[PDB]
Amino acid sequence: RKLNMSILINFLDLLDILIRSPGSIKREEKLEDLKLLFVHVHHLINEYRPHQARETLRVMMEVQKRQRLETAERFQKH
Amino acid sequence: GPFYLMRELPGSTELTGSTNLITHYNLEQAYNKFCDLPGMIDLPGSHDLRSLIEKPPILSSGTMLAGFRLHTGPL
Amino acid sequence: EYIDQGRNPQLYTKECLERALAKNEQVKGKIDTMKKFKSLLIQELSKVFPEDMAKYRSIR
Amino acid sequence: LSRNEIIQSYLSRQSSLLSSSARQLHVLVPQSPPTDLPGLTREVTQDDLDRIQASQWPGVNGCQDTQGNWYDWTQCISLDPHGDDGRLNILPYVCLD
C-alpha cells in the first residue's frame, strides 16, 4: 500500500517537474525514481508466488482428503 | 509516514515556457510596432532576369584606368 | 530570398516575431493543460484516498 | 505513438477499464505481531492446525467481507469499490484444476 501511494505521489511530483522546470536534472532521477518503485511493486508480489504455490498444494490435499471420504461414504451407503 | 522517495521540487518559478518570453526579453515594443521595402525604397528610386542574377549572386554568397579605357562615341 | 520576392524584410521580422509568439502560445497551452490535469488528479485522488492526499497536501 | 484520435483514445479507455475493472469492501485486517514461525514462535501445537482446517481465519483461510459473506481461496469475489455499476471481480487465488 505504501508503494502504491508512493507511485502516485511521485507521478504527481513528476507533473510538478513538468510544470516548473522541465530542464532540471531531477526529472531524469524522477524518470528513474518511479521505475525503482515499480520494480519493488513487482518484486513484492513475486514473493507471493512461492506462498501461493505452497498454498495450492494445501488446498489440493484438503480436497483430496474430502473426496476420498465422500467416495467411502457413498460406497458404504450402496 | 513519509512516502518512499519523496524529494524537493525545484524553485517555485524559474525560467519556464509559461512566462511571457517576449516581454521578459524586452521585445514587446517592436512587436507592437509590427503587428514593401521595394516600395519604401521606390520612395527614393524609380521601380523595384539580371536582377534574378542579382538575387542568385546573393544566394551564391583602377577607377581612373576604367575612365581612361571607357572610350566610346556619342552618336 | 524575401528581397528576391521584392517585399519588405520587415515582413520577415514580423514573421519571426509571429513564430516566436506561436511557439510561446503552444508551450504555455501544454503547461496549462498539465496544470488542469494535476488539479483534477489531486481532486479525484482526494475523493478516493482521503488520508493519503491529506498528508500530501500537508507535505506539498 | 505519433497521433491519438477520438476513436483510438476511446479504444484505449475501454481496453484499460476492461483489464482493470455503500462500500462493500473487504473488512480491513490490521498488522499481525503473532506470526507462527518467526514472530510468536509457537512450538508446533494443534489449535493452529485445527483453526487452519475447520474454522474461519480471515488472513489465512479466506477473505472476509462487509455484508458478512465469507470467501475462501478457491472462490471468486465480486465487489464494488466505487459508487458505480462497474463491479470489481477478484479472481480465485488458487484455481484448483
Give chains near D: 3+ CB pairs under 8 A. Answer: A
Judged by CB atoms closer than 8 Å, whether chains meet at A12 and C35 is answered as no
Instruction: Tell me, in Å, the resolution of the deposited structure.
Output: 3.5
> Distance (Å, rounded) from C-alpha A76 to C-alpha B3?
62
**Composition of chain D by helix, strand, coil, percent to 5:** 25, 10, 65
The CA-CA-CA angle for residues C36, C39, C41, to 5°, reads 110
- Backbone dihedral region for residue B26 (phi beyond 0: left; psi -120 to 50: alpha; all else: beta): left
Residues 6+ apart with CB under 8 A from C59: B2, B6
Q: How far apart (Å, rounded) are the C-alpha atoms in residues C36 and C51?
A: 22
Question: Does residue B67 contact residue B58 with C-beta atoms inside 8 Å?
Answer: no
Q: How far apart are CA A16 and CA C34, in angstroms?
A: 9
Q: Which residues of B touch C59 (CB under 8 A)?
A: 2, 6
> Which residues, in sequence order, are CB contacts of B71 under 8 Å at separation 6+?
none
How many C-beta atoms lie closer than 10 Å to residue A51's C-beta?
9
- Start-to-end C-alpha separation, chain A: 55
Distances (CA, A) of D31 to A2, D36, D87: 14, 14, 28
Sort out which chain D residues have CB atoms less than 8 A from A63's CB and list them: 96
User: What technique determined this structure?
Assistant: cryo-EM
Residue D88 DSSP SS3: strand
- Measured distance CA(C22)–CA(C27) in Å, rounded: 9
What is the 3 state secondary structure string of chain A?
CHHHHHHHHHHHHHHHHHHHCCCCCHHHHHHHHHHHHHHHHHHHHHCHHHHHHHHHHHHHHHHHHHHHHHHHHHHHHC
Grid coordinates belonging to A65: 482428503
CB spacing of B10 vs A29 below 8 angstroms? no
Q: How many CB atoms lie within 10 A of CB A69?
A: 9
In whole angstroms, give the CA distance from residue D29 to residue D59.
8
